[PDB]
Design a protein around this ligand. Structure first.
Ligand SMILES: Nc1ncnc2c1ncn2[C@@H]1O[C@H](COP(=O)(O)OP(=O)(O)O)[C@@H](O)[C@H]1O
Ligand SMILES: Nc1ncnc2c1ncn2[C@@H]1O[C@H](COP(=O)(O)OP(=O)(O)O)[C@@H](O)[C@H]1O
Ligand SMILES: Nc1ncnc2c1ncn2[C@@H]1O[C@H](COP(=O)(O)OP(=O)(O)O)[C@@H](O)[C@H]1O
Ligand SMILES: Nc1ncnc2c1ncn2[C@@H]1O[C@H](COP(=O)(O)OP(=O)(O)O)[C@@H](O)[C@H]1O
Ligand SMILES: Nc1ncnc2c1ncn2[C@@H]1O[C@H](COP(=O)(O)OP(=O)(O)O)[C@@H](O)[C@H]1O
Ligand SMILES: Nc1ncnc2c1ncn2[C@@H]1O[C@H](COP(=O)(O)OP(=O)(O)O)[C@@H](O)[C@H]1O
Ligand SMILES: Nc1ncnc2c1ncn2[C@@H]1O[C@H](COP(=O)(O)OP(=O)(O)O)[C@@H](O)[C@H]1O
Ligand SMILES: Nc1ncnc2c1ncn2[C@@H]1O[C@H](COP(=O)(O)OP(=O)(O)O)[C@@H](O)[C@H]1O
Lengths: 133, 134, 133, 133, 133, 134, 134, 133
């Protein structure tokens, strides 16, 4: 019921739209103003903020959210830095989207609860569908 | 048992590796020679060919394969052109990886059996996992 | 007499201006509002619409037009998608502007009556002019 | 019979291929080595040279050629500078490919015998074909 | 008394300041807003406009000015295009600042009354001062 | 008759060419070898040397030259360092080309006999020409 | 006890914080207002001023300070010009942070009591630590 | 006696020169060929290699070296990735140069034995020198 998604892109935006359809309260935060306006109606709360600043994260109230999904793409440093800040806020579950194998290793060692690799993870279940078909 | 994957990238390469682990015969075709060499051991047959040429597709024997997966990325025209050629070869099932919404619409109307959107489709099942995780 | 041009750019805009001079009824449709305003006086009907939506095409009345020219440039997917929709509307003649060799092949197989390659096609007639000169 | 084409791109390359088919001697000059290698078999003489340097132009023997076509694209300064050098070499006929309206005006005033606008010029003859059809 | 300077840079700004000290009416036009604000007090009229647009030049009233100095630097195309527009406005005297030898040749042939090369022209008078010293 | 120009660029090269035309002996020194070769015929003596090294300056014989012009551009530190070395060699007249206002202040306080600002100084005489023309 | 630091950056800011911890009176001057506000609590006196203007330096009272540290970075001309002004104010000890080898030479000849090269000087003591660590 | 320095820049190059003077065997590795040539005489072994590739690190023999100093600057990802690879090679002591506070935190959590901040660390000892003076 209490979910937060950081980064409204192809992967992050899809999570907000799907969660909103199921009837869940989702907080969407993104630096780009156009992304927040587009997903303003698809999220319970839409915020234009920078996730790499610890002062803004406290203003949003991320510590309240049990699940935080960091879906920042094409900016690996922002994704790595955001998750490191979230552990200081003792977030119980942090789900991070990885970009490559090296980024996957860094996120694992800095304390990411679950690492998502949308291109690689989709292949291993498309292949599973082929066997079942 | 008879699968063909076109385009050995992040999405296409993952399918070949996973299918090979399960014990399936997979044909891997890619224009780039480095990709084919890397996945030569992970595929039953690895071929360096261009999927946009109908003469090369007949040489491989794609008509034999019941399932063909077009995993070409960052080259939308090659992905669109390859699937159009495959329908001429009366391929029963063609699975195509889409890049954006506009590419999804084009593939649907040209006769793609199943369209895959790895970034968008993963989000709708990650969100499903969140609900099931309470 | 009944012509429709989709995409008011360097190639599409030149067709509307030349046809208007000859005294022909031309319908101009383009997503960009500035392009439609600029060519509003150079076309019998100017419409701000998206050619990739089949609902808007029926509103314009494209099925009435015998000749439809798809002059969309720099957006290959929009050009490919528009021509595929037009064949559903049983348009007799569809002329499409191609961007590269791969786009030329796709348009040919999806049922484009005539494919135009302005950069390549101009070279083969400039060269012809050199021989005649 | 004696033609020279400068810049082996979409427009320049099409002229060399078409002239070669008709059986004409064409000299192809381009800074990029890949372009010259690709069109080496499609031109009687292929040269890797920079057209903005007056010393290299004399080495090629451009003054011998009666017709010189400057098909440099995406580099307006190189196209403008090349044609200015050619007039010093008293080239009888110089055909230049223009990029926009402002480039068309500059080429006209610096002494270009014929200015070609492939995107705009193709539209005025596609529109003519529509009327004749 | 009636002077116009286009481009408020190191060379253009120095002309406005020196002319203002001598008691002359100078119109300063520049695209950058910071440059116009800095030289607003050093010019009789300061305008934020683009010199490459013929519509804006007529609004300023450049045709009234007998002397127009085009001091645009680091943007050779803007400098070349601006002077070509000014000749359409039948400006009696046009003084242009050149960037290199090739730019000097282009400006001379498009009808620049006087071409200024601040780096090169200063050397020929510093050397003259050495002989007189 | 005895002039030395350091830095063969747009400003430094113009001084050597103009002085050579008037019939003066000019020594041209520059780190770049292409610049020295280009201006070898336009100078009585052309030398490929670094002006920031005091050992090379003595080899050239700069102390003999009464007028030394430091026309180094785009390298403010080299221009500032060269003029500081020249004062140790008790050069009577040192003319330096400045790059900006801050560089003008530094050169003035380190003992530059005359500071030249080609972009700014040309404007104040172009403006003077406008007044005399009207 | 009487120290002045000019330029509140990575190097200048570290000096003010460390001196403040030890219990010393430090004057911090910087053109940027955000830097002065950030280090206002870490310095006894924080001033927003330009060090290249001799009128502002007298207002601060730099002549009173025995030690002045010029930690201006990325603006070599400001660093060079500031130290030249300080010698006119007969400052006993002037410590300057250098940017490169050429800037090091200029500062040495204009009368800098001690020149600091944080990147180079840290390497020669990290290497010393390696030898002592066996 | 057995030291390896990765990245021949202002900080890395100073370590190699100082260690070479003291009479120590230093291996210098850098992607840039000019840096390796300049420091070839100042290091016992100079190698042109990429530290982000685990295959090249084994070729050099980094596992033999007890002390490895990662002095990569202006490329934070290369510095972070290199140190992560070194821990797989069970390097006893790894000294890393940090760029900012956020990079300092990441290196600390991924297992850097000692983190060096040349700009910040020099200030705390210059200030110490002032008190002692
Ligand atoms: N520091 C940041 N804080 C919050 N959101 C960010 C930050 N940096 C980037 N983003 C957002 O993350 C999104 C990443 O999208 P993109 O790079 O297109 O790949 P994807 O859509 O797969 O995530 C961007 O839309 C951007 O707005
Ligand atoms: N015409 C083609 N025929 C076969 N394979 C192709 C063709 N064009 C591209 N490919 C392959 O498809 C792959 C696409 O990978 P990429 O663009 O990185 O995205 P992804 O890894 O998500 O597929 C490339 O590795 C390339 O080798
Ligand atoms: N989906 C669309 N529907 C209608 N018009 C479009 C669409 N997408 C782009 N266009 C128009 O097509 C034109 C293409 O112009 P451009 O890309 O500059 O190349 P060209 O001028 O050669 O056509 C654009 O001006 C744009 O307004
Ligand atoms: N200075 C030059 N001299 C000769 N050829 C050039 C020069 N600059 C660019 N070219 C060539 O001109 C060609 C222009 O092609 P491009 O910019 O793709 O547009 P187009 O194909 O329409 O000409 C390039 O392939 C380039 O190799
Ligand atoms: N299209 C334009 N119209 C008017 N002013 C322009 C235009 N383009 C550039 N300028 C101005 O011309 C000035 C050129 O300055 P710069 O490039 O620094 O060299 P300089 O100072 O020697 O002229 C810039 O400050 C810019 O504001
Ligand atoms: N340390 C040095 N000693 C001698 N000459 C130098 C030194 N550094 C640079 N130069 C020369 O000074 C010239 C400066 O030219 P440039 O930077 O193009 O501006 P300008 O042409 O206006 O002087 C360069 O051609 C360079 O060869
Ligand atoms: N003229 C000046 N007077 C005073 N302070 C200055 C002046 N110019 C720059 N500074 C300050 O010096 C600091 C230099 O910091 P920076 O360039 O980041 O490198 P570092 O942090 O290593 O010193 C800047 O924060 C700036 O505020
Ligand atoms: N992947 C890499 N492997 C090895 N060396 C690298 C790599 N990336 C950068 N370097 C080297 O590290 C050096 C960093 O220097 P620089 O960025 O100037 O800052 P500093 O001199 O303070 O280290 C560069 O000279 C570069 O050659």
């Amino acid at each position: 019921k209490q979910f937060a998604v950081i980064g409204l892109g192809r992967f992050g935006g899809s999570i907000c739209k799907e969660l909103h359809r199921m009837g869940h309260e989702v907080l969407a935060v993104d630096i780009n103003e156009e992304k927040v306006n587009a997903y303003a109606s698809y999220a319970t709360h839409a915020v234009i903020a920078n996730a790499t600043e610890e002062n803004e994260l406290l203003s949003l109230g991320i510590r309240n959210f049990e699940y935080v999904i960091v879906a920042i793409g094409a900016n690996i440093q922002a994704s790595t830095l955001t998750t490191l800040l979230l552990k200081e806020l003792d977030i119980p579950n942090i789900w991070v989207k990885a970009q490559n194998y090296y980024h996957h290793k860094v996120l694992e060692k800095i304390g990411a609860d679950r690492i998502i690799h949308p291109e690689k993870d989709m292949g291993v279940k498309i292949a599973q569908s082929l066997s079942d078909e």
